Design a binder for this molecule. Sequence first.
Ligand SMILES: O=P(O)(O)C(F)(F)c1ccc(CC(Cc2ccc(C(F)(F)P(=O)(O)O)cc2)(c2ccc(F)c(F)c2)n2nnc3ccccc32)cc1
Length: 289
Amino acid sequence: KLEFMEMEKEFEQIDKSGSWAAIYQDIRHEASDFPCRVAKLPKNKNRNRYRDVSPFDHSRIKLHQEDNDYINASLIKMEEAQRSYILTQGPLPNTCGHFWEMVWEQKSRGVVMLNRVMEKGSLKCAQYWPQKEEKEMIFEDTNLKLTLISEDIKSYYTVRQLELENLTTQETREILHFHYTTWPDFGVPESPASFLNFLFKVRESGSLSPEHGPVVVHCSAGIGRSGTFCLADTCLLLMDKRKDPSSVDIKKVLLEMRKFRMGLIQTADQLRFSYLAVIEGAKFIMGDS
Ligand SMILES: O=P(O)(O)C(F)(F)c1ccc(CC(Cc2ccc(C(F)(F)P(=O)(O)O)cc2)(c2ccc(F)c(F)c2)n2nnc3ccccc32)cc1
């Protein structure tokens, strides 16, 4: 019952002592590390948005086509939580087709975007989806067509329904796009509430359901904001599935997740926000409806 009061006091104790940085730095340095030889092949240089952010070879997503199967994307599969996610970087001008090719092949139903599209700066991301219902997009290289069907703009996020079509088989699928628009690079969401509401909308859509392929999650690099999002979702699932909610160790889960893609969660504030959201979120789910 008051098992949250203990976690909250604990959380408050860490805030009091100002140990978030030390806690975060301790987690970072125990992170596993694995090869990324494919990401580093010369022919894949223009497929990577950032020189130092690469998917591990063991968990990378492979494109089912031609000569090059490479995309900066990693499959994160959390065994106990029974949930998988594909974490990728914000699509580049030359990788938008690869991006949708992946959504198709992996049979993903939803796309979660946590950054903003920016054509200028160092933290970018291309306009990989149509902004106008009347102007659909065709990706020649991967023979796919995308059409914006609907758009519901809220103040903190925007939900969009898209229609993706395999120009070859001519079949089509409905892809749901959940765009959280107010999450700065290396920053935190507007508030725990706004973040939890966003996360709940994604859940409700059934986009995270085992019925479909894993949801595709990305930001600019696909590690800080995406890592934060996935960690909170995963810890919430564990706190529900487990007999004891306080038994969930955020450090353990983040380290576990980091075995699949490097650098998840980029700042100590993002780690603290993550824990703050899991605590409030768990009080909602295992709370009184
Ligand atoms: O929410 P996100 O995921 O979109 C993010 F905002 F957090 C983000 C943005 C940019 C980067 C690449 C970065 C810095 C970087 C490189 C490698 C890692 C690591 F995961 F491998 P780690 O194990 O060291 O923790 C982390 C961070 C960057 C930072 C700031 C910028 F302005 C920029 F353009 C690019 N990056 N990647 N390669 C780089 C080479 C030189 C400098 C920064 C570099 C990483 C994460």
